[PDB]
Design a protein around this ligand. Structure first.
Ligand SMILES: Nc1ncnc2c1ncn2[C@@H]1O[C@H](COP(=O)(O)OP(=O)(O)NP(=O)(O)O)[C@@H](O)[C@H]1O
Ligand SMILES: Nc1ncnc2c1ncn2[C@@H]1O[C@H](COP(=O)(O)OP(=O)(O)NP(=O)(O)O)[C@@H](O)[C@H]1O
Ligand SMILES: [Mg+2]
Lengths: 296, 295
């Protein structure tokens, strides 16, 4: 067992399947309904668990039915929620998602303001009990405090540096590994060219920097020279959650081997297999399926 | 004591408050959120209870946290759930509602397929114990059996004729009072003109017909002529205005038997409800409603 903590947001997606997307006022009927947990840190935690890690999700929920459902779903996936704070008399973050017969989505996201941004309460947790700490950028003070305490305990830190209104440069500063999205790296640096942006991002951290580029694969800087892992060509059904899954897998691989090229290959492999199945959690392969796939 | 039975659906409403209603595909952010029990018959029951009636809700729930919440909320509002059927290992029904800044609403209902349409079990209930029976059209077999038994006991029947996939013609047939929504009357009779549609609806029943039109108020047929009650200009959330109106209307019709007074009263209850978030939080009492209608 590798020991992973995933710090960030957990969001209930409630998915309503309709004939046409609701354009104007009036009552509509959903032929079908499913509910599934999202959140970068949450879905990464689900991935790491699937790969045989002991995983803690550390985020915020309310004391509503949604909060209880989110924690329940995560427990069922093999993710511990013991260090997740439940706010008294508080609504959790949730989306209502309408899906057309095309697959076109309307997403109404409620990021709950009842979930307070202050992360001082993480000072009550001993981060020495994990081999790696992964953080999403959607709970800024969480990532900051979680990474500061992880640094102080000599624990590896891994950022999912997605795009966000707020500036993540202080998070990157505290990241032994900063795996950005294209939008994430562009928003951070203000540079459009990914090669130049990665170089500018490297100046922010004594750790390594990476950028994921979907089917174009993943690039990182080692010795100051740009390395490339191609995506695995696969029969793609759904890329939903590929980034979250990649970051979860990357954190496990980095904590296990410490080899960047092997770790980036491993994560590219886990994410690829996830893309060949419907759903953003349903398609996440286990370690045996992932070893089988990487053997071929 | 006025004795009311409300037959229909009980639904958990998740209400997302947005800047504009979604025009096309993409990601939108809700400024605010509330979670509250809805269902036409359910919210009507809550309104009638507020107005001092002894109320029974008669519908179907699951044995999930949602079902337990829905029943709990109804008990807390003064509504008896003794005749409501609980399905074992069953999910309850739930609606996502979008509300823009004007108060325009989009409702996506998921009716749980675990809740079986069979209403034969209502034959085990004695409908003689109520003065009026209100039914929504969202549980067809329920409304049909409930109205059949109400007719047989000489009990007044009041339909909330909202829009629904099924044809409500046989429900209207059994309705002493058929209060439609604009979409409800249009789906039933085809006519887009409310005036002509009401005339076509009247042919289906020896009882009276009504149509609610939101801020445009309420119209009904009396003495072969369209009467009009304007809405009372007041708006945070119009969610459940129709349900609240129908509950209020049923109490008022049972108290006075005066259509014009009953429609004015219900218009007043529903208007006050539009000034608070959710389908239930703003439901006024008789005193609050008399006070408001005096001003
Ligand atoms: N179509 C694809 N084919 C193969 N591998 C893919 C594909 N899409 C994504 N991947 C893999 O998953 C990784 C992350 O996907 P990518 O789209 O870069 O992340 P993102 O920008 O974070 N998207 P998202 O998960 O929706 O937030 C890539 O580096 C690939 O290794
Ligand atoms: N915006 C409003 N301002 C004032 N009164 C209103 C407003 N909306 C509704 N009402 C009153 O409420 C009554 C019924 O509401 P209406 O919107 O016609 O029902 P509906 O469309 O069936 N609503 P719903 O409960 O969500 O299905 C009307 O007859 C009015 O008297
Ligand atoms: Mg991403």
């Amino acid at each position: 067992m590798i020991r992973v903590a995933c710090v960030g947001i957990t969001v209930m997606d409630r998915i309503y399947y309709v004939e046409g997307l609701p354009t104007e006022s009036g009552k509509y009927v959903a032929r079908n309904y499913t509910e599934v947990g999202g959140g970068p840190a949450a879905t990464a935690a689900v991935a790491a668990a699937r790969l045989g890690a002991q995983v803690d999700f550390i985020g915020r929920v309310g004391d509503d039915d949604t909060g209880n459902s989110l924690l329940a779903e995560l427990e069922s996936w093999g993710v511990n929620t013991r260090y997740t704070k439940r706010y008294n008399q508080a609504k959790s973050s949730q989306s209502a998602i309408m899906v057309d017969t095309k697959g076109e989505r309307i997403i109404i996201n409620y990021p709950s303001p009842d979930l307070l941004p202050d992360a001082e309460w993480l000072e009550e947790i001993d981060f020495s009990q994990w081999d790696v700490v992964l953080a999403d950028v959607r709970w800024h003070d969480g990532a900051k405090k979680a990474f500061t305490l992880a640094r102080q305990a000599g624990v590896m830190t891994v950022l999912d540096g997605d795009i966000t209104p707020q500036d993540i440069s202080e998070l990157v500063a505290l990241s032994d590994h900063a795996a950005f999205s294209e939008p994430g790296l562009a928003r951070l640096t203000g540079v459009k060219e990914m090669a130049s942006a990665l170089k500018q991002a490297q100046t922010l951290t004594n750790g390594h920097v990476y950028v994921t580029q979907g089917s174009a694969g993943c690039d990182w800087l080692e010795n100051g020279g740009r390395q490339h892992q191609p995506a695995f060509k696969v029969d793609v059904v759904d890329t939903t959650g590929a980034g979250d899954v990649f970051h979860g897998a990357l954190a496990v691989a980095l904590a296990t081997s410490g080899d960047l090229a092997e770790s980036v290959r491993f994560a590219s492999g886990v994410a690829a297999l996830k893309c060949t199945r419907p759903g953003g959690r349903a398609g996440i392969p286990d370690c045996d399926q992932t070893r089988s796939f990487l053997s071929l």
